[PDB]
Amino acid sequence: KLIGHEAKLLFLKSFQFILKRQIRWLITEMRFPKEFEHVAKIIWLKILKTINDQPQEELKLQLHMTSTISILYLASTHLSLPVYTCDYIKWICTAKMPYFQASEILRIQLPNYYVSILEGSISPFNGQLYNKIALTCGMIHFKEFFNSEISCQGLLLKLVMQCALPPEFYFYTKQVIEFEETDIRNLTLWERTDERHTGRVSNHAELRVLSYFMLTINWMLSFDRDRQYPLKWILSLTESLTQRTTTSESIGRNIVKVVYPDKPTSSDYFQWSEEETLEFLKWMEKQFLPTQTDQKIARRKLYKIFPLDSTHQLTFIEDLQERYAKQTPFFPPARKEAIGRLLTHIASQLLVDFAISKEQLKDCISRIKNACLHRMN
Amino acid sequence: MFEVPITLTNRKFAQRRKLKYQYINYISRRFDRISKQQKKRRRERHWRSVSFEIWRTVSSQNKQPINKQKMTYHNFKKIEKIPLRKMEIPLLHCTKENKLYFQSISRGLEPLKTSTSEVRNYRTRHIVTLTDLLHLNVSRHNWSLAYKIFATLIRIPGVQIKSLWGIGVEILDNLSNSSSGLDFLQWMCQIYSSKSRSIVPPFQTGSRTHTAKFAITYLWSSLINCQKSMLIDKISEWVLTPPFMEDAEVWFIYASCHLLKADINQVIKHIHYVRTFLKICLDKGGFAVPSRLIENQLKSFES
Amino acid sequence: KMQYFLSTGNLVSQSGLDLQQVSGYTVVAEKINFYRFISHFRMVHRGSFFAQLKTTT
Amino acid sequence: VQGASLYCTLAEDALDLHIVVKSLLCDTSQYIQTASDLRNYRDGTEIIAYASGKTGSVLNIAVLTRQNTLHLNRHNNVTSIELHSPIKSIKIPGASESIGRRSNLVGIITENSFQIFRIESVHSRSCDVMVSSSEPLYFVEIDDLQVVDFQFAIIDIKGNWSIGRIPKNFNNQLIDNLHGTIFDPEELSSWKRIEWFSHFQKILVFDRSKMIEIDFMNNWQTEVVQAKAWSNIRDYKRIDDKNGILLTSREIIIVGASESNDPVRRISWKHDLDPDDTTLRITVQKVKKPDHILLVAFVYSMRHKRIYMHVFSHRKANLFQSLGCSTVLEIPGGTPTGIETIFELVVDFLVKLRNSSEVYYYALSNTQNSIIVDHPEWASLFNNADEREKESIGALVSQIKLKERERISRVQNLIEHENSHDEDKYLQDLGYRLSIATNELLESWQKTKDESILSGSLSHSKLKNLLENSDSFASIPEFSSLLDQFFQYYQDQDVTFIGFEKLLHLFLHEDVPGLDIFYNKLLQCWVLVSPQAELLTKEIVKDIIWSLARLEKPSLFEPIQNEISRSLSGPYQDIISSWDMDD
Amino acid sequence: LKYICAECSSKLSLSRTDAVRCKDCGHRILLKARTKRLVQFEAR
Amino acid sequence: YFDDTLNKTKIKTYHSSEPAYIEEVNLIGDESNKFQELQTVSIKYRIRRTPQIGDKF
Amino acid sequence: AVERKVYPSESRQRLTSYRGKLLLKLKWSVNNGEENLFEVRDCGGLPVMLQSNRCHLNKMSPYELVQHKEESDEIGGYFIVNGIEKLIRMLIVQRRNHPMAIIRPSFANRGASYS
Ligand SMILES: [Mg+2]
Ligand SMILES: [Zn+2]
């Protein structure tokens, strides 16, 4: 029935087909530029040419889904588009961009060795995405062939708006950024291996950006000898950040919280509310039609025994505005507490949003914090 | 923090079950010596027994006296010393975490992390949250939400129906619309009474020998849907229909249908009828009023 | 209940109503043609009781 | 149902739940067999006196320290000053039993340890609690002991048990003569358990495999009806009334208890509760009322701080029924190491959480008619140590703060000039100055045009090396018009095209048609919050529009060259696999 | 456009599992409408 | 129509021994607020009567 | 979803009944007036006579009748029940409140004493 030992050709066809399918969804539904597609044929072309410059009938390829997302991010980053990894994580964990299947339920029957090579390694959630984009960035070289500078300043904007920080922190963190780097940010972390143990927890540019962001808030707020930032407004900031409200975004972050590996975030789904659960089942019947894989009609009637079944909630800049106002009353050692709880909530949001670990993040901001103390002392 | 209504994500839990029951075999084997594979796990788990209406237990009498200490330090480590190395062989084939689990359960320590707590796949973790919210809402009397949870859940292609008591009490307390708890139950029996392991304790079962909970509960609860009345010859028409002879409880249901229909020579025949089925209900494991009370109602009838 | 009466056409009461029969009270307004239709509304009889009686009078 | 229509479909009752009342009381993966804290009321003197509610609490460095002190009760349940003792062993359960009221209100208190098994007496007067150390036995056996039950000191060590007795007051120590075993080679988990039954002088012995009754002053032993096919015995505690038994299996609350003078099993049906968690435990509280006698079952865990509660009732026809389930939560990270109990329901207990020396009194009522963060992983990241690493941070903070002042005073005048003829001159010579540099870079893109190895022309997307020309303007709409007429100007083909609006879509999460409305929305948000929000918002929309400001490699006709040429060097039928427009 | 509303007369079409009702009125009664097709007759 | 319990497409056939033509086909929708799909239809047949032997005048 | 008129043509085509809502004002009087409750009850759909003061064709001109799919000079006087046009037919009962003198054999058979 199914191919033997040269279903490399069919494998790469379901893979490439799934890629162009995703591109279709992001130019169409995300209003990308048509140039992206060509940038994708070039990158997928380079690594296709590199795996078909490889001999063995033993396949040795890993075209996991992380490779799809890896060349999408790679191409997007060459094109300097202000999309970041967290956009991709959100997009795929909310079933909008089709992902979590081989040729989703509707196709082809392949050797179960390759269906496993697809379904396996599916998760991006421990930094697998950063590691796979750096791995691809070795597989074909970032430096001469492409421009692997991240879209830094839009990430800063994304970040300040993602909190409710006043726009001064964009320039604050932008400045600490310039202070340690002078704004030079790469994509490879590659020396093909598994092995690494120092220097290289922190050289995916983004993670360092978040690290500078956190640091900035901590330093800045704990050394406003001016007293520009009230002992209270740090609390009011924490509370306007904490109040679970139903916008497209936060609903999304809940949807990502559901498939994040570590507690607490699943205790976070515990502390959600009937409308969150409802819009959840909604997204379940919508985007888990993107499912995977006599008595049959007996189960069509059997399930058809129980029913399958002025705009209320607000937009993003609406919520953003209203918490910006919820703090609009702007104009002693236990304020360090307020600094800490704000930093830890911000951290939480970053951990679920950028699919990394608690320990990963704090490793990075620890390392690069000592990397600022060292070039400051 | 609640049970999940999904088959547990697999590999490592199964190979750990291997290591566990395999070592169990070697220790208990050498233990019987000193007193003188899915299938290895299978035989292993196998040879072992697998004023109000209290379905009483089996209390303490006719059970054998004693034992006096079998196991000193030296004697136990005698039994333990060899099967642990035999274990050293396939431990080399399993994974390092699995090997650690084997080391710790074999020391006697109990693992920190549940199967759920270490589980990992998108769809299954989402089903876990779905089912959880079902159970939570049903606990919270939120029959509306809970109903949405149930419908969205049964939609998913992975869920066979344990969840039926959820919908029985669900549509029961719902009263809202949909062809109701009775309809669901009699559906359950009509679809799953004909040819047409891990997961299974008694509250969901197969129809070789007793499917219990749902059947007896639609039975009684339907007789209470006659408490709505004062339908009966219907209920005992389809209690008449099935052969599953080890019941008697449907004999008392039958005789109760005749006492309820007895509330002129027709009423006589109904009273002689209940008089008959109470003894052909002494057939089996007895449901007893003093039953001279049953007869005393029957003499209040004989008036 | 009134619909049932119109639909099936029988007199149901514990009273007779002082009438000698239990059925034949309504009839279809046959529209076979107009001449038949109009006739229905100008028709009168004594009732099924006096129909089985074997005199000519 | 069962009795309602055995008599001749909703419930008994309407729907009521759980509330809290909280208070502080006192301050101090593979897990094992332990549980260590008690409080119970007795009076020693019994020269016609009363009982005193006492705590046996536990003090830890290594868990060496046992502490006994009194509790004075009230609606506000506090303590009075502390009384103490140590042992060299790591300490496990404190237990102080009390035989039910066939007889008397009982004496003093026992503990199990790392080696030892000790039992103390006590006398007390005038707010002091003086205890005396009824003597240890380190072991006969070199075996740890699972459970103590209670005048009879009963021990269980993993798979063998002993009935023993305690000395009288002073200074001879504890002996035994009746012994046994329930050893089972094929149960690896170490916990076994002894608690007896009916006070009949007959015991219960447990392992996660089975439940064995032992009538121990005759010779008698029984394995009661289930074994270990589908669930583990998870815990058991004697629901306080002598003839009453509460057992947690997996997915079942079991109410054993005699309904015959001889010992029992109850299969009077039961409720079920839903995990794989090994760490579950249970305890009951018992409230009294006229028409019933009801029991609240707390099943708790070491994984999640939630408490799982069910309720039963004893209408003494030995009638038992069940109502419906309820569960409450508990706070940050950690989980219960101890839950201990003592037209509405009040049920009150104490909890101690994993790795928190605090002991919290709780109370629960029916209706309503009447983070301090030390996350050592992040604080170690935020507080950094040495004084020069304090004034270091402050130094950097000042550097940037005065820098920001430079930004404000700098841009201010640039804001003064809007729609001026000066800013017009600047937008002209700016726009087409940049156009000249752009053409130059396009020529040096013609010289290297035939690379055909890549398709990313070097260091492209820029203002292209004139940097001061960016900043100086300060009017978003005339700048958007500059860019629209620059894109218009370089419409001479083989040049990049990229539509911003469709990308600001990603920024504000709604359709952002104009480069201006972007500035509006940000400006509303920040005008709520900062002075010179117009200056910053303008400086940041300028910074964004620059960070994105496209000028990538020569356009779509240039990439396809390298597209096909790399699609050449590849061997022939990967080239056959390379496939556009799937379906 | 196979069908016609019996109340408002709006011409309209249906699909697989569609609202058997007028998309304007909400009247649930529809008249069929009929399409170029060969029927043959003898003129007698 | 398609029958689900049969997984087959079945067919109501014309029964008169006298041939006819289709005149009106009415879709009788249901009330109780929409949602329900088509279940009831009325078909009106037209039968030619060139006057035959045995017809009465 | 607010009410709309139903004309008899619809009833004919749906093959149901042409009916209006029958309402009764129920008086429920406790203790001879001490406390009396009122409630208006929906007592079903009462078939209505065509062209009567409870029919929607009442007072319509020929032109309007035609626009409502009725015969131009629709007479009415009948009911529509399950698509069938049913008339309660006229009965020729006796004569009200007049004492007739009767000679009838049947009267003699109520007893030997009866004439
Ligand atoms: Mg057994
Ligand atoms: Zn219409």
Swiss-Prot record, chain A:
Other comment: Present with 398 molecules/cell in log phase SD medium.
Chain positions covered by the region annotation N-terminal cyclin fold: 9-113
GO molecular function (one): zinc ion binding
Keywords for the protein's UniProt record, in alphabetical order: DNA-binding, Metal-binding, Nucleus, Transcription, Transcription regulation, Zinc, Zinc-finger
Entry note about domains: Although it shares weak sequence similarity with SUA7/TFIIB, displays a similar subdomain organization as SUA7/TFIIB, with a N-terminal zinc finger, a connecting region (composed of B-reader and B-linker regions), followed by 2 cyclin folds.
Protein name: RNA polymerase I-specific transcription initiation factor RRN7
Example of a GO cellular component annotation carried by this entry: RNA polymerase I core factor complex
Chief place where the protein resides: nucleus
Leader sequence segment: none
Full-protein positions shown: 94 to 514 of 514
Region listing for C-terminal cyclin fold, in residue ranges: 114-223
Family: Belongs to the RRN7/TAF1B family.
Curated annotation (Swiss-Prot), chain B:
Subcellular location: Nucleus, Nucleolus
InterPro entries: RNA_pol_I-specific_init_factor, TIF_Rrn11, TIF_Rrn11_budding_yeast
GO biological process per UniProt: nucleolar large rRNA transcription by RNA polymerase I
Primary location: nucleus
GO cellular component, one term: RNA polymerase I core factor complex
Keywords tagged on the record: Nucleus, Transcription, Transcription regulation
MF-aspect GO terms: RNA polymerase I core promoter sequence-specific DNA binding; RNA polymerase I general transcription initiation factor activity; TBP-class protein binding
Misc. comment: Present with 476 molecules/cell in log phase SD medium.
Role description: Acts as a component of the core factor (CF) complex which is essential for the initiation of rDNA transcription by RNA polymerase I. After binding of UAF (upstream activation factor) to an upstream element of the promoter, CF is recruited in a SPT15/TBP-dependent manner to form a preinitiation complex.
Subunit record text: Component of the core factor (CF) complex, which consists of RRN6, RRN7 and RRN11. The CF heterotrimer may further dimerize to form a hexamer. RRN11 interacts with RRN6, RRN7 and SPT15.
Protein name: RNA polymerase I-specific transcription initiation factor RRN11
Organism: Saccharomyces cerevisiae (strain ATCC 204508 / S288c) (Baker's yeast)
Gene name per UniProt: RRN11
UniProtKB/Swiss-Prot annotation, chain E:
Main location: nucleus
Post-translational modification: The N-terminus is blocked.
Chain intervals annotated as zinc finger (C4-type): 5-25
GO CC term (a single one): nucleus
Protein's cellular compartments: Nucleus, Nucleolus; Peroxisome
MF-aspect GO terms: DNA binding; DNA-directed RNA polymerase activity; zinc ion binding
Keywords: DNA-directed RNA polymerase, Metal-binding, Nucleus, Peroxisome, Ribosome biogenesis, Transcription, Zinc, Zinc-finger
Binding positions for Zn(2+) per the UniProt entry: C5, C8, C22, C25
Family: Belongs to the archaeal Rpo12/eukaryotic RPC10 RNA polymerase subunit family.
Protein name: DNA-directed RNA polymerases I, II, and III subunit RPABC4
Species the sequence originates in: Saccharomyces cerevisiae (strain ATCC 204508 / S288c)
Positions spanned in the full protein: 27 to 70 of 70
Swiss-Prot record, chain F:
Compartmental location: Nucleus, Nucleolus
Oligomer and partners: Component of the RNA polymerase I (Pol I) complex consisting of 14 subunits: RPA135, RPA190, RPC40, RPA14, RPB5, RPO26, RPA43, RPB8, RPA12, RPB10, RPC19, RPC10, RPA49 and RPA34. The complex is composed of a horseshoe-shaped core containing ten subunits (RPA135, RPA190, RPB5, RPO26, RPB8, RPB10, RPC10, RPA12, RPC19 and RPC40) where RPA135 and RPA190 form the DNA-binding cleft. Outside of the core, RPA14 and RPA43 form the stalk that mediates interactions with transcription initiation factors and newly synthesized RNA.
Family: Belongs to the RNA polymerase beta chain family.
Protein name as it appears in the record: DNA-directed RNA polymerase I subunit RPA135
Purpose: DNA-dependent RNA polymerases catalyze the transcription of DNA into RNA using the four ribonucleoside triphosphates as substrates. Component of RNA polymerase I (Pol I) which synthesizes ribosomal RNA precursors. Besides, RNA polymerase I has intrinsic RNA cleavage activity. RPA190 and RPA135 both contribute to the polymerase catalytic activity and together form the Pol I active center. In addition, subunit RPA12 contributes a catalytic zinc ribbon that is required for RNA cleavage by Pol I.
